Design a protein around this nucleic acid. Structure first.
Lengths: 240, 240
DNA sequence: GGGATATCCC
DNA sequence: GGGATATCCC
């Protein structure tokens, strides 16, 4: 199973998280910081070697998006059956101190979910599956960068911005919740839970329809969200 | 002074502003793509040692945010005059045909611009000058990242994400415009001209005052502002 | 012009 | 939760 195989190779098969810094054509190295906007990519870069791997020994093609504002990170599939498209999307998140509850943002709620074609490499329908690859790290901060330029020799010196990474795979609908992850950016939110709750997929929506419906009609303004619904209890009761 | 000194440094004191890729500690390199959220940060890393070296040589202390979502990136200050705080923010944009017109997005019009302390490192009132260090660049059209992992020796075979970089130092009110930069995120729009106009510091606003009142007044959307004001030439009369 | 990519702060 | 960094895409 693409999945089983996948999950398998994600948990240290020989993989080690060691990205120390950025490098300029001048040969001089600049360390990282807690910028999430860059860490994200670093997280995806760790996966890109392993997805493609499996994908290979399974006979599917992988297609990264050409444009900067389209979902999802990866698009696996076989030409023959070019309707059985799977979709993998990398999501990171940080912790401060050990064993805290986490949460991720699961993506747009007013895009291809409701539009089918808006911002997605392929029309929403060609996908049979949508997976999520979640990462958790202990951010090492109290930050203010590392005010210094390095060289190819001090690599070992270079401090990283993360510690004790944790990965897991799961279907999106399984770990989705009933609250926006981001406001203005209309994102969906994840379940507030213990990392392991994710592994196990101890969610809240009973199936993928329950997850689409809920999100399909999650009004955007609190004003309109009152006389309709704010959560699972609210929605469920809305079934009658 | 502090200002023109910075410029020299930032105007070919030798620097090239080129990046290669990401770099691990086992020494294995990974290339980059034109992704903005990344490039905007790398350009950042480049700027910090340049800034530090100048300030420090004029006896200024430097400040960086702890929160990743507060303004400004940099914060130079003289303790012998703590109320004389200056801001520096890196702003990037790209173009294909090495010449076409330009546009930047300089911050939110509904935060420190109207309440003194929302999402700002120190209070707005404690700042004398607000500077924009802008970078422009030609990006390899389309986008091809590839997944090869070079190394120090193959430092040359590695594809760069951009080429022909440009930089400018100028004041925030001189380069601002009368249209939004973005919408949902509520950002100020830089002027839509040509590199040079920027260097010229050939704007539209009359004063650092007009721009203030201006953006201080920007209604969040079409409905409201369409019957108030939608541009400076409109701002004007409205002022009566 | 409005909303889209990611995830975060108070 | 609402608004914030980064800027773009359509």
């Amino acid at each position: 199973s693409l999945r089983s195989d996948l999950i398998n190779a994600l948990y240290d098969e020989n993989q080690k998280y060691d990205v120390c810094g950025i490098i300029s054509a001048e040969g001089k190295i600049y360390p990282l910081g807690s910028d999430t906007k860059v860490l994200s990519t670093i997280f995806e870069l760790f996966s890109r070697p392993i997805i493609n791997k499996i994908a290979e020994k399974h006979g599917y093609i992988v297609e990264e998006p050409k444009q900067q504002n389209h979902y999802p990170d990866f698009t696996l599939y076989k030409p023959s059956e070019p309707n059985k498209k799977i979709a993998i999307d990398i999501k990171t998140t940080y912790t401060n101190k050990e064993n805290e509850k986490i949460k991720f943002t699961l993506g747009g709620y007013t895009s291809f979910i409701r539009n089918n074609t808006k911002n997605i490499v392929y029309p929403f329908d060609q996908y049979i599956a949508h997976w999520i690859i979640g990462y958790v790290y202990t951010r090492v901060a109290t930050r203010k960068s590392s005010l210094k330029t390095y060289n190819i020799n001090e690599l070992n010196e270079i401090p990283k911005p993360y510690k004790g990474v944790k990965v897991f795979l799961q279907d999106k609908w399984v770990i989705a919740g009933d609250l926006a992850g981001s406001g203005n950016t209309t994102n969906i939110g994840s379940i507030h839970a213990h990392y392991k709750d994710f592994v196990e997929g101890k969610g809240i929506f009973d199936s993928e329809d329950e997850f689409l419906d809920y999100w399909r009609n999650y009004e955007r303004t609190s004003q309109l969200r009152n006389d309709k619904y704010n959560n699972i209890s609210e929605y469920r009761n809305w079934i009658y």
